[PDB]
Symmetry: D2
Subunit: 387 residues, 4 copies
């Protein structure tokens, strides 16, 4: 079992399976992939669609004629396979002109070029049917304190995103924006480093309803944070527009391992949350097949992404449907957590002697929470060791 179907909404970036294995210390170990072949190979694996940076699809500096031919070859592959394009984004980090950022580069003319390069690809994204446009400000940041006034940089970041919102509104486009946070790498520190910082920034834009987040498993874990906890706050705010699934082994460089690798229990609690909250967006894999692999290992790693999600989905469903677990959840008072603290109102709480004057603090302190039994039941379900 555990066979993906386009109904599962699994998507892959062209840059993921297409990664050649260039890391900061070694040359590429794999030849470049034609975007057309990647689309065909992913379709055979059961994927729902692909995503792209502008420069993944149209090589940098291409003429409007060559650009025309690239889009046509790509769209023919989409038609031949039934693959969708739910998301697109801009490469504002590879070319040396972006070495100090795009939207927040110190040089004003670089910032204007970064906006024009973005707007050009929004047009293409809408043509191809994308519903979400992702922004990863990988070069927005600094290695030293004096190089960037962060208040001025946030002014420039806000100005860029308002202008992009004004453009999609004036064009009548049906597309939303999602910010993909990352705490560091390639810059020493990157602006808007976590999901929380991105959510706070969004509330200061002119049209906040146009903007959400695209959190990535590995990036929040590069700051040692609880990724399921962060996704829950994003859902609670109504801002989970998209999500990047992969693996990461703690606080170190951005590994981009296949989903399921890294923190396995965190992946279980993530799928539990996404499935019970009814997240209906794409399940997007932003990962890198290790450079030890040939092309056969590339497709095996991409297949593993989808397989691990489906296994975890099965185990999280069985966990929540188990009547013994439902009983344990009541023993830990998860049901009381969901009830209002004071629906009777402030004045009733103040006049309630059972809440303070006559509250038996020692009797309440004595109640065990029963969390460890519940967590071992979750472990048994994850490992398939219930019976």
């Amino acid at each position: 079992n555990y066979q993906p179907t386009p109904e599962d909404r699994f998507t892959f970036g062209l840059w993921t399976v297409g990664w050649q294995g260039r890391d900061p210390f070694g040359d590429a170990t794999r030849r470049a992939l034609d975007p057309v072949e990647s689309v065909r190979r992913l379709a055979e694996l059961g994927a729902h669609g692909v995503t792209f940076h502008d420069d993944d699809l149209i090589p940098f500096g291409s003429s409007d004629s060559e650009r025309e031919e690239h889009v046509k070859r790509f769209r023919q592959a989409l038609d031949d396979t039934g693959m969708k394009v739910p998301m697109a984004t801009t490469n504002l980090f590879t070319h040396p002109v972006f070495k100090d950022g795009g939207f927040t580069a110190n040089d004003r003319d670089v910032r204007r070029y970064a906006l024009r390069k973005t707007i050009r690809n929004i047009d293409l994204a809408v043509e191809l049917g994308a519903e979400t446009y992702v922004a990863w400000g990988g070069r927005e940041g600094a290695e030293s304190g004096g190089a960037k006034d962060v208040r001025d940089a946030l002014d420039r970041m806000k100005e860029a995103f308002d202008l992009l919102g004004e453009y999609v509104t004036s064009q009548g486009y049906d597309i939303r924006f999602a910010i993909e946070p990352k705490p560091n790498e390639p810059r020493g520190d990157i602006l808007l480093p976590t999901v929380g910082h991105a959510l706070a920034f969004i509330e200061r834009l002119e049209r906040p309803e146009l903007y959400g987040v695209n959190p990535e498993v590995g990036h929040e874990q590069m700051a040692g944070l609880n990724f399921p906890h962060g996704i829950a706050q994003a859902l609670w705010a109504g801002k989970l527009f998209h999500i990047d699934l992969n693996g990461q082994n703690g606080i170190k460089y951005d590994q981009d391992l296949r989903f399921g690798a890294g923190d396995l229990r965190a992946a279980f609690w993530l799928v539990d949350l996404l499935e019970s909250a009814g997240y209906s967006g794409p399940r997007h894999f932003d990962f890198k097949p290790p450079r030890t692999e040939d092309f056969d290992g590339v497709w095996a790693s991409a297949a593993g992404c989808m397989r691990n999600y489906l296994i975890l989905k099965e185990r999280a469903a069985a966990f929540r449907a188990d009547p013994e677990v439902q009983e344990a959840l009541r023993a830990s008072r998860l049901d009381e957590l969901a009830r209002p603290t004071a629906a009777d109102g402030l004045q009733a709480l103040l006049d309630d002697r059972s809440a303070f004057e006559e509250f038996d603090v020692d009797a309440a302190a004595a109640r065990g929470m029963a969390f460890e039994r519940l967590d071992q039941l979750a472990m048994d379900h994850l490992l398939g060791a219930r019976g």
Copy 2:
């Protein structure tokens, strides 16, 4: 030189110099301090004021009569010294009843008790002249994934803070609330773990103008984040109500070292930012004199907090006033960062061929940013090695 004066607005928590040295592996190494003696000793050192948890001032379970005597003894010490009380907060973490949290405990009756305990101390804070009321949700969190539905917990957290805002409004109190984030410890993960998460949460309250943040140097660094960067976003949003100054040596347990210790360059860039942005609030030290020290080392460590701030203030002022630095800032185009990207508007940017069609991407890519020369000038100023 480097002598503090109450005009410098340096404050200390009673729990800081009063810490007895109890850590998870060892007994206390110092006897308890009378709050009256701490106020007198801090006044002699040049401090501006003190802060307190309710249970620092009035021992838990005290009668209304003993409580009366404690407040009176305290206020007499404030009058004898001229010390102020700019901030107060609630202890919702020491007593075993709070072992699963206060505002977000699974048990509903514990949540109601936590609200009543808080409201009682808001009354006392206003009486004593506090302008800011701090909330540190140290027990709001979890060690395992099934123990806490984070969406429900955020519902309960929002409900608590709205009720507190409704109370201070109905009483006509002139006091604001500040959330002090912490990523972990004592809980495995703590809700609202960074300044960003706290800022985002605040925008969902009913009266957001009543709530800001109280970031602590060490806590953002426990997630490997750039503390000056986070303070800048808090200032940019208008939410820096208060700040906790200390030291921390990277990602590990919460050290609470004296300010200046830990990341020294981060402390320099922090003081630069606070002084140039015109932060006018208290400079509050939330620190622990190491348990290796006797009472003489306690007062030496508290004196060092204030000394290091004043030295860093002098060096950051000299850095910004140096005409060679002002020249280097222009060489790195910090002046262009502060200018609007597109004050001419979206339509003018789209019709501007110098921004894309005729932009010389290679000429712009060739410009060095000159950041390293600027950063060595900052190092020379920090070390007093200019000449």
Copy 3:
């Protein structure tokens, strides 16, 4: 299934299930446990034995008469249950006299007291049948650079361990020493912070054959290290005398979660290594039942430690016995890794043109390693999703 038996050699410290829930921010949530009841309760759970600090068994400052009665009550419980005592250790960290360390305290008279306190408990350990004596230097370290000359401290550390080795040799005791490394907490930095540093230090003692390591899962992970990798180097050196099993969620305070929690895949690879290398020592759990739990949750958490080990043992055995895995291991050339690089000798390697002059570097570069397929087979086995 998954029922422990004393044949599985599972052991627990008295301080583990006996932990009262005192953390740096809150009072104890559980009453103290009689060591006799802990022995009886662990025997019922299927445990093989217990371990103890001197001060866990005999309260500090006890007379030789009360000490006599404590040992007698304890030994009667061991006889009534069949429980063993394979390991003992000294508490050189709780009492305030040890606030700057024991073996490496700056004060010479404290160092001499620390040696005498240790020697007294070695006598008791041998009487009770312990084969390993563990040393955790939790207070050996510093919060600041000038407080400790590390070369002098290592001189004092070496002097202490040589003296202990001279004592057990002169007494004819059959006991070995094991060092338990920890990188930090409670001290800002702790000496001998990892398994590697401890192994290197041991080679400088007078009788190195008497000393090995007692690594703990959580402690190596507090430095972001690969715990299975560290255990493999300890086995390779012949120094794995003992091991502490628990869980930890990355780089933060020492969590001491039940084994299986934390990094689940790391726990799988650990059990694989221990079982295939034929580690025959105790499987010791150095963990803390969370302070949210009552006594029922304490025993459930201890039962979970043993259960998770037995599940992981089953899955690692099935992984290694799978002929498809054995085939994949050959596809990744694990068999070639085990063969000598140059058994033909140096001169034969130099005269071998197939090793350099005629080596086809591009043909070898093209071979995929097939690691991702192998790792997904390990994931399928871990999750019980093979079929």
Copy 4:
């Protein structure tokens, strides 16, 4: 002042100032540097010498004739400038053939090629006058647990280093080997991840006296470790053959910032230790000028490396020469730390009632260590704020 002279023994790798700015997300921002020009430019800056990988000097795949011309052009630049070559090393990480390692690659023929490539460059190093040969096993490691049997890998690592030692002995070469540890990146985990693991491994080689360590500031800090503490253990063992100086801002990707940047207080305590222990080897800078910089910023960053060392040297000397500091060191009993615990021997310690039976544990517990006053004196000296 603060002007370097070749007497200060400052060295730079050709790959440092020669770094083109290729990181995992962006193209190079600087053109390649001729090794001859780098030697001339570093000589003008006051450097003592340079170091090189084989492939830095002789491009990969070069004929024996072109190789001859490269060495000749290089040696002429050394003669024209007076620059020395104290250290050389092998590139066993860039070419795709090394994607699973060199000495510990699973494929046996790759391991033999890696040994031959190394031996060829040892010949060149000795010709050029190098005294130390550095080994950085950047590709020795794994991303997943099943890919590498670490015991077998350590067997292959030991076999490689013994063979290299047999070669330099048979040739009568006067050169030593130094291992440069790194915990991760580019591999998920790297073998021998810290200075401690490298020191322990060395004691298992056939000729341990031939091997030491080359620790790097940033690498130990990528595991959150205290770099001065690790250097002290390396000195204590007699194994500090060489050292790499740079900066790093905590646990994240390998930043390789200029020395002085990153953890400034750690850099102060490092220079204090190196200068007081009489380290006489090269002061080598393994750093990367940020890719934001042009060639002018490259030379400014390299000049800053040497400047910051000389400033820190001055401040550490003034700290140790201050009679008030010498007094504070006695107040903290640093003098007692250096005295033997029990030069009177074991039997005298056992018969000494002042060490246990009559030891006043409470009087000793009451003595403050006075560490905070001492550490603020060190801060005052570092900042030049004594007077």
